[PDB]
Design a protein around this ligand. Structure first.
Ligand SMILES: OC[C@H]1CNC[C@@H](O)[C@@H]1O[C@@H]1O[C@H](CO)[C@@H](O)[C@H](O)[C@H]1O
Ligand code: NA
Ligand code: NA
Length: 434
């Protein structure tokens, strides 16, 4: 597998949340999430990544007019993450195109960019079914210019992304731009969509971003419907005009149909197998690119939920993938219920992991009181390998075999170690001091 790198050349293992669905409907575009909430997340789970939801409607409230005050607010939040050593992926998020689909249900595009052409959007028994209503299908068909009536819309979208990239190009905490949440093709579905207008929008948007930001990873998603459930994607390779190596990453989601017991469990387990095979294939098509599992999640109160979550994280580990869990929002899917009580997720996610590796991690494992990591060396890297150790299992000092301890910060929970680069692959084992 391939990895995103920090400025020191270290390979990043990214673990965090989507923050947050509450931003979708907020008039000011910000999630209901405070700096104290982040402090709690970090204290409880030691996360190092966030998929932070932004919106086209907040970036470009009128055609060609970008809201710099909104971008100030995003920058403020990014600062909270920066101060705690997080890396940030900005997600241009939408569901069902826009809030403007009913006079709320959807989110994303500004009202001026929403053209339903008078076609109906009647109430449906679940929100996903709004996607196939005449007015919503038309809004998407207009956006992709399948109708031929709105070539300007993708151009606006690309330049809205350029405005965001212009603000964040020099932001050391931002590592990735997730160009579009869960692309939906309207009347176009499958390869005709993914290899057609979807790939074309990604290329235009990448090109626009690269006018102002040469180094941030541009992350592209397949269409969500079908591919979320383990079907193959027809997405094609996107060119990165940056000087040097390509910085495109693949950001699919995973949402098995049965969602964890009985035949449902078997169906979900083979879905993971199919999803892995397909994800690996498309990551190759895109140029042997890094993978970020941009979303997966479920009601943690469902029997078998822990086994599912642990299998997904194990699969992500084997694939060298980052993970942003859906989501930090309060409720049974998230790490905390509305009153602040921890769900199953906290103890499940709160495990040792390597955050930034001085070399390519070839394999690793962890339990509550042990981490083992094998590193393919890179002599050019002078920064230490950085590892998270939970206080639960590591209440005092560390015992490290296979590396020299550089520092052990018992407050931030960051262990830094140094390994030789001229002795082949190195295995580092970390356990609690006696
Ligand atoms: O259904 C869970 C997520 C699937 N991937 C896209 C995410 O936006 C979804 O989050 C849900 O979105 C819905 C529409 O905005 C919203 O009503 C729910 O509260 C979200 O959990
Ligand atoms: Na409109
Ligand atoms: Na950056």
């Amino acid at each position: 597998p391939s990895y995103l790198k920090d400025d020191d050349g270290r390979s990043l293992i990214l673990r965090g949340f989507n923050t947050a669905s509450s931003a979708k409907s907020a008039p000011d575009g910000m999630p209901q999430f405070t700096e104290a909430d982040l402090a709690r997340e970090y204290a409880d789970m030691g996360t190092n990544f966030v998929r932070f939801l932004i919106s086209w409607r907040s970036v470009e409230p009128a055609p060609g007019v970008y809201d710099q005050q909104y971008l100030d607010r995003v920058e403020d939040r990014v600062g909270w993450y920066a101060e705690r050593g997080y890396k940030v992926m900005l997600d241009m998020h939408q569901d069902v195109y826009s809030g403007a689909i009913t006079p709320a249900i959807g989110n994303g595009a500004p009202a001026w960019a929403t053209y339903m052409d008078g076609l109906p959007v009647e109430p449906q028994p679940r929100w996903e079914l709004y996607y196939i209503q005449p007015g919503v299908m038309r809004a998407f068909d207009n956006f992709w210019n399948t109708t031929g009536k709105h070539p300007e819309l993708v151009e606006h979208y690309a330049k809205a992304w350029r405005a965001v990239a212009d603000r964040f190009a020099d932001n050391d905490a931002v590592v990735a731009y997730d160009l579009m949440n869960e692309p939906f093709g309207g009347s176009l579905q499958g390869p005709a969509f993914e290899a057609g207008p979807l790939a074309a929008m990604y290329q235009r948007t990448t090109d626009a971003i690269r006018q102002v930001d040469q180094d941030t990873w541009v992350c592209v998603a397949p269409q969500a419907i079908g591919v979320n459930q383990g079907l193959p994607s027809g997405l094609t390779k996107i060119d990165d005009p940056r000087a040097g190596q390509q910085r495109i990453a693949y950001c699919p989601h995973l949402y098995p149909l049965p969602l964890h017991e009985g035949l449902a469990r078997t169906l979900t387990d083979v879905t993971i197998d199919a999803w892995r095979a397909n994800t690996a294939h498309t990551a190759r098509v895109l140029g042997d690119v890094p993978i970020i599992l941009g979303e997966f999640g479920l009601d943690t109160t469902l029997p078998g939920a822990r086994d599912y979550i642990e299998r997904v994280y194990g699969t992500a580990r084997e694939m060298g993938a980052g993970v942003s869990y859906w989501s930090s929002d309060p409720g049974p899917w998230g790490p905390y219920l509305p009153d602040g009580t921890q769900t199953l997720l906290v103890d499940t996610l709160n495990k040792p992991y390597p955050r930034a590796v001085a070399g390519t991690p070839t394999e690793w494992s962890s339990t509550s009181d042990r981490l083992q990591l094998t590193i393919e060396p890179d002599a050019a890297i002078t920064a230490p390998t950085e590892i998270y150790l939970p206080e639960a299992g590591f209440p005092g000092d560390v015992h490290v075999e296979g590396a020299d301890v550089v520092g052990w910060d018992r407050q931030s929970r960051l262990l830094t170690v140094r390994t030789p680069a001229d002795s082949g692959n190195v295995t580092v084992t970390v356990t609690p001091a006696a």
